[PDB]
Structure 1
């Protein structure tokens, strides 16, 4: 028993027919810029992988954001730079304006455009049913683009989505965990945040694809329409698979892992139980019912499936009646 393999149903051979220099981020040269052009103003935040500053381009007075990367691996650093460059100009993908060496830290520093973002705790307590569809379509444009350029995000969550609600502007940020989908390739299952890890990561299945991003988008949507943040609230990676299973049930969980000849961590024998699949109507109450509709549940239902192969792709998702009410773009 070794796991059965898997391919993406879409965009399977994008990077097989693109040049080597497209996807091979190892053999990539960084074209540096003048660091004296930028003047730091304010610390916005500290991560495990970087510090982040609000800043000002001194050459044209533009406001700007500077992600100074901590030293970890030149592999990971060039990878983020090369994916951002490849995706430059795509819809609602955040724009890399420059790359400079910070003289203090001696590490690369990524200069992005500025987004006048709103706190996500303030924002998900205020979105109307229309706003939720609007921005979900906007994230979908971004996901289908990056998938169509042969790149999975692997860290889709509300913190990584900057929304300027004033101008209805949206931008998908932090491509630090993004990677190139190559068919047959086994990836590291230690990606994304806990609440938004799909079951493939949780059962240690390494041959995942673009559709991982769709599971996470489904988690984001569940919390927005049901007003439960986070929707699957697990204490650790083992309990996370149990919370999903209290909702989606264990019979379909076992079908999923038998289909790919995956064996569960023995520790599950003593915590997993047997759980009926629940109907989405149970999560509906007086305080979130204005956000729920038949078409919202239908869409959500097609995103939160165990089988990564049976999930809606980004393009199929954009075709759902859930988005019919949303205003498009003939002019």
Structure 2
């Protein structure tokens, strides 16, 4: 029996085919002359990022110049950005222009890099920003979409405005129950066990593992938390913490077999309690509720992880939920 999402299972079934059939998307291009590059903001594997301006309004934007890319892949990101445009803490696609090739125009966000920000984040900042990120995840999941590349680099945080935006939807996909996906998604350190053991019928829960990796890195001040030197080593790094008994049960449940070369690397390991990662430098960020929350994200079995909605309801976010009401 194929694995299926515990939540939002049927969202794309009841949608018109036009909603998820991104491959048939007719892109309505603007014109490049409407937007102008000001300063380079960053480099990427698929694109170059620039801080730019709308010439016909002096309005500042982010310009993402997509490098070489297939027609199918460009339409997937554009269609998904359009489908999600307006949701909480989702980056907003303003326009799509081209010379060929393309170029995506987004709203501007004055982001601070996580390598500078996270070491200064307080216990409350972490609870606050993770909660904001969960808003984004619950929304895109409820719209039948998995992000599949959750990581600090794709979470833009304006620390003075205390805004958060989930960006780079280039690896996102539509969730269709029963579908086998590519496991070569996400970024190494944030890859869920499903991608490392070749479980292809995964779902939204993949994003919750990635979140857990981010979360562990923040509260334990350990970046990245799971530091594998390749995809096989990535599993080993996880097994040395979660332990191999839980790994074996998970493989058994989904009738998975590790190839012998990977099996030799994984070996045998006892579970390392989350408390073993507490030290003098990070102790102010760790509490019984933070550990319980993290422990419910970082499970081998994707079905056993908290959903975005369940995560928002966790006691770790009690103060943030109450402080938000007003």
- TM category (shorter chain) comes to over 0.9
The aligned runs of 1:9-28 (5 Å cut-off) are: 9-28=6-25
The Cα RMSD (Å) is: 1.0
In structure 1, distance between residues paired with 2:265 and 2:315: 39
Tell me the alpha carbon deviations over residues 43-90 of structure 1, each in whole angstroms, 9 at most, x when there is no partner.
222322112211110111111111111222100100100000000010
Give the alignment partner of residue 31 of structure 2, picking from 25, 31, 34: 34
Give 2:179's aligned residue.
185
Report whether the alignment pairs 1:207 with 2:201: yes
- TM-score between the two structures when normalised by the length of structure 1: 0.96
Moved more, 51-60 or 213-222: 51-60
For 1:155 and 1:232, how far apart are their aligned partners in 2?
Answer: 15
Distance 1:75 1:330 in 2: 42
Corresponding residue for 1:56? 53
Aligned counterpart for 1:217 among listed residues 211, 215, 219: 211
Q: Which residue of 2 aligns with 1:247?
A: 241
Q: State the match for 1:263 in structure 2.
A: 257
Structure whose residues are more often helix by fraction: 2
Tell me which residue corresponds to 2:276. Answer: 282
Mapped partners of 1:216, 1:265: distance in 2: 24
Cα distance in 2 for residues equivalent to 1:217 and 1:223: 10
Residue in 1 that maps onto 2:40: 43
Q: Distance in 1 between matches of 2:140 and 2:244?
A: 33
1:138-162 deviation line (CA, Å, top 9, x unaligned): 0000000000000000000000000
Instruction: Provide the residue aligned with 1:148 in structure 2.
Output: 142
SS in 2 for 1:177: coil
Report if aligned partners of 1:118, 1:162 keep a CA contact under 8 Å in 2. yes
Structure 1 residue 329 and structure 2 residue 324: aligned?
Answer: yes
Q: Counterparts of 1:39 and 1:74 in 2: how far apart (Å)?
A: 24
Secondary structure of the structure 2 residue equivalent to 1:125 = helix
TM-fit CA distance, 1:5: 1.5
> Which 4+ runs in 1 deviate beyond 3 A?
327-331
1:266 positional shift: 1.3
Counterparts of 2:228 and 2:68, CA distance in 1: 31
Query: Equivalent residue of 2:119, what SS?
Result: coil
1:269 Cα deviation (Å)? 3.2
Q: Which residue of 2 aligns with 1:76?
A: 73
2:307 is aligned, of 308, 313, 325, to: 313
Identify the range of structure 1 (145-154 vs 49-58) with the bigger mean alpha-carbon deviation. Answer: 49-58
Matches of 2:211 and 2:262, distance apart in 1: 26
Q: Which range is displaced more, 216-225 or 52-61?
A: 52-61
| TM-score (norm. length: structure 2) | 0.98
**Is residue 203–residue 265 contact of structure 1 (8 Å, CA) maintained in 2?**
no
Tell me the residue number matched to 1:228.
222
Query: Which SS does the other structure have where 1:325 is aligned?
Result: helix
Gap runs ≥5 in structure 1: none
Write the distance in 1 (CA, Å) between the matches of 2:214 and 2:135: 16
Distance 2:159 2:185 in 1: 29
* Alpha-carbon distance in structure 2 between the residues aligned to 1:155 and 1:180: 14
> Who is 1:95 aligned against?
92
Secondary structure of 2:133's aligned partner: helix
Task: Give the Cα–Cα distance (whole angstroms) in 2 for the partners of residues 155 and 210 of structure 1.
Answer: 11
